[PDB]
Amino acid sequence: MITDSQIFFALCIALTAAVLAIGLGRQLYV
Amino acid sequence: ATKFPKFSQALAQDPATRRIWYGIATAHDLESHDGMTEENLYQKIFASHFGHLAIIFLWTSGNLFHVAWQGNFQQWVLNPLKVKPIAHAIWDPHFGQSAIKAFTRGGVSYPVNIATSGVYHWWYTVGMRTNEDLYFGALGLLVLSTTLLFAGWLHLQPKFRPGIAWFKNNESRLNHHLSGLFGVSSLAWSGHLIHVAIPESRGQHIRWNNFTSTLPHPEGLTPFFTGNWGLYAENPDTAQHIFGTSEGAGTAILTFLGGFHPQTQSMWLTDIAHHHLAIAVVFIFAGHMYRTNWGIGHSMKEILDAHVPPKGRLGAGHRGLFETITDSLHMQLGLALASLGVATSLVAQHMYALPSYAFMAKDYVTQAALYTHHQYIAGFLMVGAFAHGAIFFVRDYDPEVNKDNVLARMLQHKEAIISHLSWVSLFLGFHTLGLYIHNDVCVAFGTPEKQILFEPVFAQFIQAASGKALYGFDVLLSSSTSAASVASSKIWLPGWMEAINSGKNSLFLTIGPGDFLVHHAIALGLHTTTLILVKGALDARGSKLMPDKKDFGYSFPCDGPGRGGTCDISAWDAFYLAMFWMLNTISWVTFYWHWKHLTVWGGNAAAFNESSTYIMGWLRDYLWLNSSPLINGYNAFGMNAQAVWAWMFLFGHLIWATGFMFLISWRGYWQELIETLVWAHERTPIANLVKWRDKPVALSIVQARLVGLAHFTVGFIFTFAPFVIASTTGKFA
Amino acid sequence: ERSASIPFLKKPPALDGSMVGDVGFDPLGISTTIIELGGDLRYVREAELMHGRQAMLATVGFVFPKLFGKLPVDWAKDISLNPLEAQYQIPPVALGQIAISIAIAEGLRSRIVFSNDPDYVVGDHGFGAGMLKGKSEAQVKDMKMKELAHCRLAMVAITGMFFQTAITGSLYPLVD
Amino acid sequence: MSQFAADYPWLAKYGFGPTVKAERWNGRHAMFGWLAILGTGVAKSHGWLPSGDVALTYNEWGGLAQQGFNTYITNERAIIMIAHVHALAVSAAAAFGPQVLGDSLTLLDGEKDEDPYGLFVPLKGTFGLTPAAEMANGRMAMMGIIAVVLTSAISGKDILEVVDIGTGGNLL
Amino acid sequence: SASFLPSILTPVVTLVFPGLMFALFFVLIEQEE
Amino acid sequence: EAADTWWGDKDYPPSIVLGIGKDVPSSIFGVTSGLAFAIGVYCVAQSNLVNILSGSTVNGFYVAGALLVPYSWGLHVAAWIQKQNGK
Amino acid sequence: SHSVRVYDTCIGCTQCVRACPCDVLEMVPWDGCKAGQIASAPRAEDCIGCKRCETACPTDFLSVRVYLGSETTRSLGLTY
Numbered sequence A: 001m002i003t004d005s006q007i008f009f010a011l012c013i014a015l016t017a018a019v020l021a022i023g024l025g026r027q028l029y030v
Numbered sequence B: 001a002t003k004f005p006k007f008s009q010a011l012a013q014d015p016a017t018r019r020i021w022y023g024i025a026t027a028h029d030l031e032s033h034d035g036m037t038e039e040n041l042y043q044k045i046f047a048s049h050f051g052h053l054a055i056i057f058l059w060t061s062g063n064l065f066h067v068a069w070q071g072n073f074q075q076w077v078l079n080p081l082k083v084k085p086i087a088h089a090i091w092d093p094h095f096g097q098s099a100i101k102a103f104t105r106g107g108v109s110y111p112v113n114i115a116t117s118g119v120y121h122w123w124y125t126v127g128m129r130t131n132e133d134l135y136f137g138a139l140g141l142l143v144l145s146t147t148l149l150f151a152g153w154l155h156l157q158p159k160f161r162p163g164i165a166w167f168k169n170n171e172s173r174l175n176h177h178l179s180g181l182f183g184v185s186s187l188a189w190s191g192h193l194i195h196v197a198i199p200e201s202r203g204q205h206i207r208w209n210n211f212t213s214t215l216p217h218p219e220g221l222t223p224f225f226t227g228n229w230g231l232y233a234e235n236p237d238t239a240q241h242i243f244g245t246s247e248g249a250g251t252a253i254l255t256f257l258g259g260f261h262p263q264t265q266s267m268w269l270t271d272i273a274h275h276h277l278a279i280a281v282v283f284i285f286a287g288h289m290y291r292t293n294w295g296i297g298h299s300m301k302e303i304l305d306a307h308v309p310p311k312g313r314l315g316a317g318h319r320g321l322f323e324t325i326t327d328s329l330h331m332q333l334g335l336a337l338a339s340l341g342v343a344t345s346l347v348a349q350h351m352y353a354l355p356s357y358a359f360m361a362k363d364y365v366t367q368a369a370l371y372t373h374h375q376y377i378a379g380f381l382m383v384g385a386f387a388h389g390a391i392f393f394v395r396d397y398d399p400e401v402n403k404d405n406v407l408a409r410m411l412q413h414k415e416a417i418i419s420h421l422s423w424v425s426l427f428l429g430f431h432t433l434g435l436y437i438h439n440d441v442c443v444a445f446g447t448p449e450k451q452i453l454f455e456p457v458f459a460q461f462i463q464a465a466s467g468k469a470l471y472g473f474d475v476l477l478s479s480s481t482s483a484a485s486v487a488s489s490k491i492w493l494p495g496w497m498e499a500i501n502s503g504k505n506s507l508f509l510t511i512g513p514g515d516f517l518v519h520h521a522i523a524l525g526l527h528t529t530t531l532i533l534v535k536g537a538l539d540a541r542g543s544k545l546m547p548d549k550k551d552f553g554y555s556f557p558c559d560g561p562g563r564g565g566t567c568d569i570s571a572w573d574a575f576y577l578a579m580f581w582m583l584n585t586i587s588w589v590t591f592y593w594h595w596k597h598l599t600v601w602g603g604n605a606a607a608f609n610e611s612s613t614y615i616m617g618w619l620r621d622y623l624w625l626n627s628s629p630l631i632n633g634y635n636a637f638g639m640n641a642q643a644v645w646a647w648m649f650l651f652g653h654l655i656w657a658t659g660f661m662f663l664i665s666w667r668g669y670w671q672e673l674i675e676t677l678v679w680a681h682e683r684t685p686i687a688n689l690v691k692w693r694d695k696p697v698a699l700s701i702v703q704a705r706l707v708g709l710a711h712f713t714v715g716f717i718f719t720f721a722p723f724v725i726a727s728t729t730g731k732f733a
Numbered sequence C: 001e002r003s004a005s006i007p008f009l010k011k012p013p014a015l016d017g018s019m020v021g022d023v024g025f026d027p028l029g030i031s032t033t034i035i036e037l038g039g040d041l042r043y044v045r046e047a048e049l050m051h052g053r054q055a056m057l058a059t060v061g062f063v064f065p066k067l068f069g070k071l072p073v074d075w076a077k078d079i080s081l082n083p084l085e086a087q088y089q090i091p092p093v094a095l096g097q098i099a100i101s102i103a104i105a106e107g108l109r110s111r112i113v114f115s116n117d118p119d120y121v122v123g124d125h126g127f128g129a130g131m132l133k134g135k136s137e138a139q140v141k142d143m144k145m146k147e148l149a150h151c152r153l154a155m156v157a158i159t160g161m162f163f164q165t166a167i168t169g170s171l172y173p174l175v176d
Numbered sequence D: 001m002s003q004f005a006a007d008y009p010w011l012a013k014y015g016f017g018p019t020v021k022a023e024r025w026n027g028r029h030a031m032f033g034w035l036a037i038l039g040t041g042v043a044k045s046h047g048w049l050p051s052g053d054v055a056l057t058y059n060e061w062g063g064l065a066q067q068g069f070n071t072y073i074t075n076e077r078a079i080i081m082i083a084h085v086h087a088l089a090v091s092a093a094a095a096f097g098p099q100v101l102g103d104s105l106t107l108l109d110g111e112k113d114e115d116p117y118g119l120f121v122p123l124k125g126t127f128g129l130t131p132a133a134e135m136a137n138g139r140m141a142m143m144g145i146i147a148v149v150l151t152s153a154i155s156g157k158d159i160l161e162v163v164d165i166g167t168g169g170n171l172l
Numbered sequence E: 001s002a003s004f005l006p007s008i009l010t011p012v013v014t015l016v017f018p019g020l021m022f023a024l025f026f027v028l029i030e031q032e033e
Numbered sequence F: 001e002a003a004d005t006w007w008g009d010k011d012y013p014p015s016i017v018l019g020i021g022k023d024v025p026s027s028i029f030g031v032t033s034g035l036a037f038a039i040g041v042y043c044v045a046q047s048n049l050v051n052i053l054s055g056s057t058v059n060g061f062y063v064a065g066a067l068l069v070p071y072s073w074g075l076h077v078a079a080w081i082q083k084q085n086g087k
Numbered sequence G: 001s002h003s004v005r006v007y008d009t010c011i012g013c014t015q016c017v018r019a020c021p022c023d024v025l026e027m028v029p030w031d032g033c034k035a036g037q038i039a040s041a042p043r044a045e046d047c048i049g050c051k052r053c054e055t056a057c058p059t060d061f062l063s064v065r066v067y068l069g070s071e072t073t074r075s076l077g078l079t080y
């Protein structure tokens, strides 16, 4: 069983990955 | 400027809707954008590589997280043959009550999708036993994706952009790839197997907290250092092992028994670690080849320039191939896609032939889906390799650099090659269609004894030479007291012979005349797809109908209706034509595999052996018979869990059908229709105040061919996948 | 021609002096393959500097809990020896503050390092400036050389401590 | 600021992003949501009307019944959700309606965003219905929401009951 | 309690996110020099 | 860069195709080719005359000597190259 | 706008100019053939790309060549 704190930690890591993905996409830019 | 195709001034000034379509469609064509240099192109490709790698690892982390969170891995470990693996939970506000009760399956109480990708068996073999392990793997891959995204951002920075000389360093890159990325990774996987996966198979629990103090072997680095490497092979797992527990287990970490584990019907885990160790050593030695910074090693230019046969047999040899490959990214990419397509077709053959994951070859649905998956991907990569070779010929091939080269001679005798591919394809098609129609008419007229049934003696001879002993050929491995049968008789032979001579494995399936006919059909498909692709690649630079085809580029609509008519004359149109043939031959391969395994799994191989020799047998015994659980997913009396597969079956039918729109009807009809609609909108009250910014026009000719082809392919995939999943699920055999 | 560290090897062409600690020690030629990419040695010097600073703080932190004692506050029931095994008994209601403080500090330092600006002396974060006023370039160079020497010594030291306490019971001359 | 103005010119033109308008609106929303949190505390205190033990059947709510893990959505969550949906409908009518009596959600045609800055926003001498004092109140409300969320997450208690520690006998 | 996350994230992501992306993409398409 | 290794206009490759062994005379190449072939065939014959076993009979000296059979191919090719070059 | 080029294999037989529906081509004096004229394309911005000139050329592998390029409101033939 995966606890709620673990899921929220994974969500925080995914949010940081999203911000870095936006940074990379805007570094290639349009 | 501020317009959307900032990379194409030509597209930004287009006043029509063609600008948006062509800006989306040409976004990744980094060679043709405005003001692009080579160095900037290589740097952008490096950053895109990093982003794509991060996407891959994010996808894998998502699979791990969903199986950990909404899966039944705990229940599936305790009973793998009877518990259905779970992909993820379903959230749908469109469901009715009976759909909620119908999709509530497995041990869970919520609507749910049953996983058909085989990720449960793969993780179960490599030591995963709890949901916490899957969650920690998901976290690790999330952090890895984050790191890769930051690296991709970092290497576009002004002080971290690598130069053009760094990218064209072939010797250093190949040395590091061949040593590190292959051998060191294989060595690390062998280490993981021996430290975690093999002890988990024997009941031991090895994790990050106790792996550094638990010896994988009872001695530990003493047989390795002393040289008594055979001590690691003694006491293997007996043939009563029971996977995951300790009864009948052994203390061996590197063996080569060969064959299958008797309970899991998969290869021994100690064979796999030994295999990985051998591949690791071989790849490190192979990466110790090219000269980088220390004098020893080869120069790739000298090897290519030296390989000229003595008296003009291959022209100037391979002189100038080093300069063409390094300066053309289309040739490198084409070689990479060709090799990867061969590789994924090889994994498709070997994962059903020699399963390595425990308790597969009994699910049958993952077994069908993985094979069809990898075969379709193999066809795609194979078509793409030839497409990029055509692109390389169009805009990367230098005739003066390749004077009398081994590559220019290919263009010198291209007519012979295309004509002989034409002869082979016509011969194969004529003969296999004639044999199939003959068998059709003979069976239809009540006389099945008049069929032309050729026994496939060459492949049966190969099976006998590998050890199969029912054909009675009595050669090599099938015959004892032979040099091949004696030399390996005490390393890997007994396991191989007890695995190849049983009727429960997919090792070297018994083949008859239907196998002969369908193999000839497969050869027909391969030769015709090769015909179209090779003809497009070789005539990409010009032909008699258009001697200046290189001036117009790789993809262009036509050359007008003059001099007879020039429909579909570019090499892109050759790709577009060969896509259909690839889909056809992959469908043939997957139909053959699926029907043969459907008859073998049910213990009714005689049905295939009797009905595969004529086309109506296929039509009425595979397609018509096995569609009954699929099309009955929902009906007038209710629905069950295969209603989604029935809906997707009709969905793929409709997409495949609406491809025929764009493939058969061409621009003019639609342009006049659009003009009438433009008048309608401009001349109606109330609604003429709403004005478009981009003038609506019909789709361009190449765009229409692409859209129809994409429709054809998506409908093809989405009508074959529900059948190959639901028919196997609807029979359980 | 030849390096001042390895006398029988050629001098690294990237290490042409004019930098603290440049004794020409680069047998692999890492700095050779950095500048032919068009880069410089600012980032790798910054990495070495904070690697060494964390190494010094680490050398004090391995020895301090057992040689002297623990914090007077509660929850300090973590093992005095085995700091590498004392990582896992830290309560999360202190790891949160530790992670937040390091996160904001490294965010500010990331804004400093990755910016673009050419006036940034490598390592000059501005945290330490209370003792370098009124000094010649020789004094500042000597002070930075002492910092770099302590950096490399502390990194070798912490590698020794971690490889000793994991295999052997503890450090020999000071513990047990 | 100018970093985000250069990074997102289309987004910073209309006042979106880290601007004073956004932070004032978020402070106002935090104030009203603090009032809503207190009102829901009173709702669990008195038991005015909603009961959170019964379920939402399919036959009266469609696919917005059983949704998560085949788990029932309760009448209390449904009632609070309906109230929030009505607040959001009033919100959409105010955001996309005539700009009467109100500071706009976005910036109009070529108008500069205001700047009461921040720091400490002097409370003395700015009493009454002043933008600086309302600004301070919304800033404190947002920090109170952050502190309550963190305290509830750490303590493992209910968000509505982690503030019941700091009241004593109040409402519920 | 992790039984709320599907019903929260799936509508938010699947409906709200691509609608805003379609509007933003259309606006970025039709802006000119 | 590299060296001009192309020999398409000559009947034999130049001596520089041998790399580090570009100065070894042809007689040494041929004698070592014969010796390496004989030793390698003997070593691989010690794997079929005696049944190679799982660890008991592996004899890594015979494994290292088994690599002389592909090495013997390169030595007799290099013997021909040096002979046509006059070395 | 498409780009139209005329090569020196012209014979000045004028069929491309007559076949042009957009008044793109015209005849200019020349001395490289018996007719004393070569085709020219001074109004390539009015080119639509229908390649009626290339159908009308009698020379082996046509001397007047139209390369499809950028699309405008004239080269698309849009009345709206």
Ligand code: CLA
Residues within 6 Å of the ligand: B045, B046, B049, B050, B053, B166, B167, B169, B172, B173, B176, B177, B179, B180, B181, B182, B185, B343
């Ligand atoms: C030892 C050092 C080393 C290592 C490990 C790598 C590693 C890598 N480099 Mg690299 N590189 C190096 C040195 C190294 N490089 C040097 C020195 C140079 C300069 C000369 C370069 C220049 C360079 C460039 C220019 C690029 C890379 C790229 C890459 C990446 C390849 C993409 C990928 O993931 O394929 C991983 C592939 C494998 C692990 C093997 C695939 C092949 C096998 C047959 C697959 C099947 C194996 C197995 C059956 C799989 C089943 C697993 C499971 C599902 C059962 C990879 C991360 C590319 C990239 O992505 O950039 C970010 C790229 O563009 N490198």
Ligand code: CLA
Residues within 6 Å of the ligand: B422, B425, B426, B427, B428, B429, B430, B431, B433, B434, B528, B531, B532, B577, B578, B580, B581
């Ligand atoms: C079922 C549909 C179908 C069939 C039968 C064919 C058949 C063929 N295609 Mg084809 N094609 C199709 C659909 C089909 N295509 C579609 C949908 C596309 C996508 C646009 C293409 C795209 C395509 C391309 C791009 C190419 C082909 C080529 C070929 C030829 C391959 C050589 C061959 O098999 O010769 C066998 C001949 C036949 C099967 C035709 C039937 C002839 C008779 C009726 C057979 C009778 C049997 C027996 C001999 C009777 C005795 C005769 C009697 C007088 C004694 C062949 C004519 C290739 C080609 O022409 O290369 C040479 C090629 O380049 N096709």
Ligand code: CLA
Residues within 6 Å of the ligand: A007, A010, A011, A012, A014, B055, B058, B059, B060, B061, B062, B063, B065, B088, B089, B090, B091, B142, E005, E006, E007, E009, E010, E011, E013, E014
């Ligand atoms: C690429 C991998 C991938 C894919 C295809 C999915 C797919 C799905 N997830 Mg999901 N997820 C993933 C990774 C992935 N997940 C990861 C890594 C996490 C850990 C943070 C989660 C955590 C998660 C939760 C907590 C929930 C889902 C849910 C869902 C479902 C509804 C969609 C939704 O609301 O997603 C929302 C997903 C997120 C907010 C997390 C971001 C997902 C990854 C990190 C983004 C990857 C982008 C990918 C590379 C594509 C890029 C191109 C794209 C921009 C077009 C859907 C089946 C919901 C569900 O179970 O419904 C039944 C749900 O409640 N996901």
Ligand code: CLA
Residues within 6 Å of the ligand: B093, B094, D061, D062, D063, D064, D065, E010, E011, E014, E015, E016, E018, E019, E020
């Ligand atoms: C995958 C995402 C997704 C989700 C989560 C939903 C969700 C829903 N759909 Mg829907 N739909 C989708 C995609 C989706 N749709 C697509 C792609 C199509 C086209 C094929 C449709 C076509 C469709 C039809 C034809 C109908 C629905 C209906 C419904 C509702 C189910 C009936 C019910 O119990 O509520 C009952 C409904 C309510 C209680 C009203 C809720 C109030 C609204 C929906 C909330 C406001 C949302 C807000 C405006 C979003 C702004 C987006 C913008 C920022 C871009 C539910 C709200 C039914 C419906 O809406 O009932 C009238 C219905 O008749 N859907």
Ligand SMILES: CCCCCC(=O)OC\C(C=C=C1C(C)(C)C[C@H](OC(C)=O)C[C@@]1(C)O)=C/C=C/C(C)=C/C=C/C=C(C)/C=C/C=C(\C)C(=O)C[C@@]12O[C@]1(C)C[C@@H](O)CC2(C)C
Residues within 6 Å of the ligand: C056, C057, C059, C060, C127, C128, C129, C130, C150, C153, C154, C156, C157, C158, C160, C161, C164, C171, C172, C173, C174
């Ligand atoms: C809060 C401020 C910072 C406090 C932290 C601190 O410490 O300050 C930082 C600082 C300077 C400063 C500043 C202040 C003036 C202090 C404050 C300023 O701020 C303002 C605004 O003014 C900032 C700054 C930077 O200017 C100076 C600190 C320097 C420090 C801490 C230097 C330790 C080296 C250790 C070594 C070399 C270990 C060797 C160990 C060796 C060589 C061994 O062989 C050990 C070993 O043999 C053993 C024993 C047994 C064996 O079995 C194992 C081995 C073999 C491994």
Ligand SMILES: CCCCCC(=O)OC\C(C=C=C1C(C)(C)C[C@H](OC(C)=O)C[C@@]1(C)O)=C/C=C/C(C)=C/C=C/C=C(C)/C=C/C=C(\C)C(=O)C[C@@]12O[C@]1(C)C[C@@H](O)CC2(C)C
Residues within 6 Å of the ligand: F026, F027, F028, F029, F030, F031, F033, F034, F035, F037, F038, F044, F066, F067, F069, F070, F072, F073, F076, F079
């Ligand atoms: C002491 C012996 C005396 C007689 C022998 C000898 O000296 O003659 C030398 C000679 C002629 C000569 C002479 C001159 C040099 C011209 C002049 C001499 O006078 C002088 C000194 O000037 C006289 C003379 C007559 O001698 C000609 C030599 C010809 C020679 C030596 C031809 C080798 C082929 C190798 C092949 C095809 C390898 C295949 C290898 C294979 C197929 C494999 O590797 C398989 C493999 O599984 C293996 C086995 C191991 C695995 O790991 C790797 C794999 C799996 C791949």
Ligand SMILES: CC1=C(C#C/C(C)=C/C=C/C(C)=C/C=C/C=C(C)/C=C/C=C(C)/C=C/[C@@]23O[C@]2(C)C[C@@H](O)CC3(C)C)C(C)(C)C[C@H](O)C1
Residues within 6 Å of the ligand: C025, C026, C027, C028, C029, C030, C050, C051, C052, C054, C055, C057, C058, C059, C061, C062, C083, C084, C086, C087, C155, C156, C158, C159
């Ligand atoms: C330079 C060069 C070369 C080189 C080199 C070499 C040798 C490079 C080596 C670099 C090296 C060795 C870099 C170490 C970093 C380690 C750090 C920063 C550790 C921090 C440690 C921390 C932050 C730990 C903190 C702890 O709190 C924890 C975790 C638990 C507590 O209970 C205990 C303490 C407080 C301790 C070549 C390759 C030889 C040739 C080339 O050509 C040129």
Ligand SMILES: CC1=C(C#C/C(C)=C/C=C/C(C)=C/C=C/C=C(C)/C=C/C=C(C)/C=C/[C@@]23O[C@]2(C)C[C@@H](O)CC3(C)C)C(C)(C)C[C@H](O)C1
Residues within 6 Å of the ligand: C104, C107, C108, C111, D026, D027, D029, D030, D032, D033, D034, D036, D037, D142, D145, D146
């Ligand atoms: C300075 C700087 C840095 C920084 C920083 C920092 C520390 C940034 C911190 C930002 C921070 C801390 C931002 C909090 C926002 C809180 C909000 C928006 C709360 C909204 C809450 C609202 C709008 C109310 C919502 C509800 O009322 C609703 C609608 C209904 C109620 O039923 C429920 C509630 C009451 C909840 C770095 C990282 C170092 C990098 C760089 O150097 C720049």
Ligand SMILES: CC1=C(/C=C/C(C)=C/C=C/C(C)=C/C=C/C=C(C)/C=C/C=C(C)/C=C/C2=C(C)CCCC2(C)C)C(C)(C)CCC1
Residues within 6 Å of the ligand: B330, B331, B332, B333, B334, B335, B338, B342, B385, B386, B387, B388, B389, B390, B392, B537
């Ligand atoms: C267009 C082009 C291109 C491409 C091409 C291609 C795509 C190709 C392909 C190719 C291919 C795809 C090939 C294949 C091959 C294969 C092979 C070559 C195989 C082999 C095998 C073998 C050799 C084996 C043998 C054996 C063994 C060992 C085991 C046992 C049995 C036997 C004996 C069988 C490029 C880019 C280059 C450029 C130019 C143009």
Ligand code: SF4
Residues within 6 Å of the ligand: G004, G019, G020, G021, G022, G023, G024, G025, G046, G047, G048, G049, G050, G051, G052, G053, G054, G066
């Ligand atoms: S393409 Fe058409 S309009 Fe243009 S020159 Fe040729 S015939 Fe005239």
